[PDB]
């Protein structure tokens, strides 16, 4: 039986990294083979250019930066497919959705253009959206770290959620770390148990 | 008056670099402000990864490599737009067409997916296609340097030429360097003189 591809999305400070780490821990403690992945994955050459960019150490033309973020996902596709075929469930901290939402929050970027590079990536079996008021997210904890930009990103995320081809689940990320974790864990157990019967799909196609 | 954006395309060994160099020389000698550009532009960080890839010094997942080639064009867009607005005609040795044709020659790559990343780039005013039999190209002068792959690339180029939104001009590249140059020079003079009256367009949109 293949593993499940579970993605956590949300604006900055929504609790994605905290919940992805806790989810992998709990699934492993309950006997599942599960591993954490994140995007961008900064250990690669592409990821290094992305990190310099996000730290404002370098400036990059907006379309180039968008394409590098997508290429950074494609470079991990062979690994993603191999792990899933091996029975390993992958918990992914940000994915193509963040890619479209953050670039789509910029001027003169259509959602259609932003989606294309990621068309065909492994399709998540479950996309958890950690919902919380922007003002709350701002009380917790770089480029894109301002309220007006987060608000436009959030709107883009809501457009992507109209996409019925995907198993979106809303999570109330305003609760305690432990309460949000239990909600996420129960949804993830269900997806691992029931969403893996069908072959891995292809995103946005 | 803005400069013209002229692109030279063709399979490997078609004479693109020789003709692009000669064209810029002749236009400048005839009083035009013209400069040469090429893709990939290996002087950048992205271009360096592309060069390692083409030299087989590194392996790269096919979708990532496709997106890096496109990002390498977008990183030069601000410069392209500035030069053209300044009256400078740009002669470009390979462009988005090569990008689509070479990736589209690989298995499981649709032309549509291959075009998307380059949608919206500056639209060439003239696209010269240096036509010559593959067997001839092979008598002149790396990754992709085998006949079966060049033949699939060539077929992709012929699909792109169905695109009526673009000013494609076929050149008989089997003639002498000087004869091919004169054909190219005359077409280029016409485009500089007549194709620049309208604003710079956007590719594939
Ligand atoms: N449910 C929560 N309640 C309060 N603070 C939280 C909660 N989840 C995470 N945090 C804190 O908010 C900050 C951002 O969390 P993090 O998981 O890194 O978010 P993200 O990856 O979405 O930016 C961290 O300091 C974290 O401890
Ligand atoms: N018209 C031509 N006839 C014969 N050889 C040519 C002609 N044009 C170019 N060549 C030679 O073919 C080789 C490849 O030319 P080049 O301009 O670098 O092609 P490309 O950039 O399309 O690969 C070079 O050695 C060049 O001198
Ligand atoms: C995956 C992904 C993220 N992003 C954004 C979301 C974040 O704001 C940012 C990286 O923020 P940064 O603060 O540098 O890192 P981290 O959140 O790990 O501490 O990248 C994109 O713009 N495109 C993408 O494809
Ligand atoms: C511009 C571009 C070229 N190409 C290919 C065409 C050439 O085969 C190759 C670079 O070949 P290489 O032999 O490394 O360089 P050059 O032709 O300058 O000596 O890149 C792509 O695959 N995608 C692209 O977007
Ligand atoms: Mg995080
Ligand atoms: Mg489309
Ligand atoms: Mg050349």
Is residue B53 within a helix (H) or strand (E), and if so which, with residue range?
helix B45-54
DSSP B1: -
CA distance B181 to B95: 19
- In angstroms, this model's resolution equals 1.7
Collapsing DSSP to helix, strand or coil, B79 comes out as: helix
Asked whether B111 lines ligand 2 (CB < 6 A), one says no
- Residue among B63, B3, B65 at smallest CA distance from B37: B3
Partner residue facing A67 (CB), from B60, B61, B74: B74
- Tell me how the structure was determined: X-ray
- Residue among B193, B142, B119 at smallest CA distance from A63: B119
**Helical H runs in B57-199?**
62-74, 77-85, 96-104, 111-115, 134-137, 147-160, 177-194
CA distance A170 to A183: 10
Whether residue B51 contacts residue B41, with contact meaning beta carbons closer than 8 Å, is answered with no
Backbone angles phi, psi at B176, to 5 degrees: -65, 160
Q: Dmax of chain A from CA atoms? A: 47
Domains and CATH numbers, chain A: 1-205 (3.40.50.300)
For residue A5, list its beta bridge partners: A90
DSSP B167: -
CA-to-CA dists, residue B164 to A48, B114, B168, B196, B203, angstroms = 40, 18, 8, 18, 12
Which residues between 115 and 154 in chain A have a beta carbon less than 8 angstroms from any beta carbon of chain B?
A: 116-117, 119-120
Is residue B51 within a helix (H) or strand (E), and if so which, with residue range?
helix B45-54
CA distance A144 to A139: 16
For residue A7, list its beta bridge partners: A92, A127
Atom of ligand 1 nearest to the CA of A14: 22
CA distance B138 to B200: 36
Whether residue B96 contacts residue B203, with contact meaning beta carbons closer than 8 Å, is answered with yes
Give the pocket of ligand 4 (CB within 6 Å): B 12, 39-40, 54, 69, 94, 98-99, 102, 142, 144
CA distance B67 to B63: 6
* DSSP per-residue codes, chain A: -PPPEEEEE-STTSSHHHHHHHHHHHHHHTT--EEEEESS-TTSHHHHHHHHHHTTSS---HHHHHHHHHHHHHTTHHHHHHHHHTT-EEEEES-HHHHHHHHHTSTT--HHHHHGGGTTSEEPSEEEEEE--HHHHTT---TT-SHHHHHHHHHHHHHHTT-TTS-EEEEETTS-HHHHHHHHHHHHHHHHHHTTSSPPEETT-
């Amino acid at each position: 039986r293949r593993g499940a591809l579970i993605v956590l999305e949300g604006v900055d400070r929504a609790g994605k990294s905290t919940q992805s780490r806790k989810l992998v821990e709990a699934l492993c403690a309950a006997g599942h083979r599960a591993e954490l992945l994140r995007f961008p994955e900064r250990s690669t050459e592409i990821g290094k250019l992305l990190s310099s960019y996000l730290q404002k150490k370098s400036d990059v033309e907006d379309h180039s930066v968008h394409l590098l973020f997508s290429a950074n996902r494609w470079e991990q596709v062979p690994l993603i497919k191999e792990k899933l075929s091996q029975g390993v469930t992958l918990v992914v901290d940000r994915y193509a959705f963040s890619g479209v939402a953050f670039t789509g929050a910029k001027e003169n970027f259509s959602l259609d253009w932003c989606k294309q590079p990621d068309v065909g990536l492994p399709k998540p079996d479950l996309v958890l959206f950690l919902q919380l008021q922007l003002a709350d997210a701002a009380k917790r904890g770089e480029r894109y770290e301002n309220g007006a930009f987060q608000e436009r990103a959030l709107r883009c995320f809501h457009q992507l959620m109209k996409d019925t081809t995907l198993n979106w689940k809303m999570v109330d990320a305003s609760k305690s770390i432990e309460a949000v974790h239990e909600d996420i864990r129960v949804l993830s157990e269900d997806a691992i148990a029931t969403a893996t019967e069908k072959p891995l799909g292809e995103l946005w196609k």
